[PDB]
Short mmCIF file of C-alpha atoms in Angstrom, two decimals:
data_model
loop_
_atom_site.label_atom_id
_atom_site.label_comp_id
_atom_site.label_asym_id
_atom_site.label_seq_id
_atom_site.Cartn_x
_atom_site.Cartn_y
_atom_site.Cartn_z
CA UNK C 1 5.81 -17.96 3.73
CA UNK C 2 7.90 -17.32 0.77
CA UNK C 3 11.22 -18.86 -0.12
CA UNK C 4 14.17 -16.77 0.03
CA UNK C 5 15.06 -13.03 1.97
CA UNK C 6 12.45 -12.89 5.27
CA UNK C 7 13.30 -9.04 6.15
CA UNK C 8 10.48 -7.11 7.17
CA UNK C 9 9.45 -4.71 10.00
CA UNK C 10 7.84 -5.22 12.95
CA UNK C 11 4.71 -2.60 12.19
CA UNK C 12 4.13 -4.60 8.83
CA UNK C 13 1.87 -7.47 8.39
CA UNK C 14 3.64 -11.12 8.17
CA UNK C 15 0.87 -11.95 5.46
CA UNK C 16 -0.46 -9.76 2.36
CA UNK C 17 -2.00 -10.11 -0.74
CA UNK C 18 1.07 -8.38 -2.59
CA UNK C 19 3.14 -5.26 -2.60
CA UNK C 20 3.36 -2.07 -3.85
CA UNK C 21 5.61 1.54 -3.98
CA UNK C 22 4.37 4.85 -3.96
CA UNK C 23 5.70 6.51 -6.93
CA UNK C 24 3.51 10.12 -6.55
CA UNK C 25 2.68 12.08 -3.59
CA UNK C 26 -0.94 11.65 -2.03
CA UNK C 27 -1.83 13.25 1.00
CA UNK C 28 -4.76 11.57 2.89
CA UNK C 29 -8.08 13.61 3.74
CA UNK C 30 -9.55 11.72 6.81
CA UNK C 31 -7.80 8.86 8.95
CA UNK C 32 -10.02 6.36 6.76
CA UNK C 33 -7.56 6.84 3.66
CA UNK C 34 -3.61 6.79 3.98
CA UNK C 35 -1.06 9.34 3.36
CA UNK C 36 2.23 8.41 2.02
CA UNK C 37 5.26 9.64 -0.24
CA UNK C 38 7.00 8.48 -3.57
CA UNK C 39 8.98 5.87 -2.01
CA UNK C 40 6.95 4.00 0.42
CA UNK C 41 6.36 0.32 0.56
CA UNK C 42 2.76 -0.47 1.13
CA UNK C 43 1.64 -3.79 1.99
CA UNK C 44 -1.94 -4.30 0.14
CA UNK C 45 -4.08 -6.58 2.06
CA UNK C 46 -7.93 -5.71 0.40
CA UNK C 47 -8.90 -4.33 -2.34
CA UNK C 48 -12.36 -2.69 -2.85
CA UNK C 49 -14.15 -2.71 -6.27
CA UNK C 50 -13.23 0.72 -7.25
CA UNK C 51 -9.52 1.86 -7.61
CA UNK C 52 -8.89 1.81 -3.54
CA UNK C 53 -7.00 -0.88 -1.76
CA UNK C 54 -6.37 -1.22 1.96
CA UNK C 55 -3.09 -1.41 3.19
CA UNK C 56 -0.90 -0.64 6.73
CA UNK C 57 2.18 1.89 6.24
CA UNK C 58 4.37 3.00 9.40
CA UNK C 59 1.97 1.19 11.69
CA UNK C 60 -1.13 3.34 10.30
CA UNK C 61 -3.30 1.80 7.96
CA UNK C 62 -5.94 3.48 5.37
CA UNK C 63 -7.39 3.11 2.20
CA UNK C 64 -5.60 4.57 -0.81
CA UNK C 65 -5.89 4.86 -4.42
CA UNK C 66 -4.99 2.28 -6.68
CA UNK C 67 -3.20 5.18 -9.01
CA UNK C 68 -0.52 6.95 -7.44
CA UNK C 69 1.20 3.08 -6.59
CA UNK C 70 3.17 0.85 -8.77
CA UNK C 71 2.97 -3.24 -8.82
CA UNK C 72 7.03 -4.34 -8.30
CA UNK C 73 5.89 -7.51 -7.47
CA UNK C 74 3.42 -10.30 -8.93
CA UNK C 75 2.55 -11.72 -12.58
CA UNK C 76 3.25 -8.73 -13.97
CA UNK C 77 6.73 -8.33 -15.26
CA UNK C 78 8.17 -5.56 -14.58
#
């Protein structure tokens, strides 16, 4: 629990590891990975060795590639 603005949706997940934006398109090949489009908020919650995190967008969750996102938000300034 943060301190400051507390607006997020209902389908995403009070508590996650960080967050992250789409910035290419990447469509999904089986349910297991995620399908989303430059300009999507995804809420990273795991993180597997390789470049693939899990996180839940619009309610449906897969695993997606640690490439086609962008980090707005952690130690990293920028």
């Amino acid at each position: 629990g943060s301190s400051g603005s507390s607006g997020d949706p209902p389908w995403a997940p009070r508590s996650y590891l960080e967050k992250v934006v789409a910035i290419y398109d990447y469509t999904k090949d089986k349910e297991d990975e995620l399908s989303f489009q430059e300009g999507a908020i995804i809420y990273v919650i795991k993180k597997n060795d390789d470049g693939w995190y899990e996180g839940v967008m619009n309610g449906v969750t897969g695993l997606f590639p640690g490439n086609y996102v962008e980090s707005i938000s952690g130690p990293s300034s920028g």
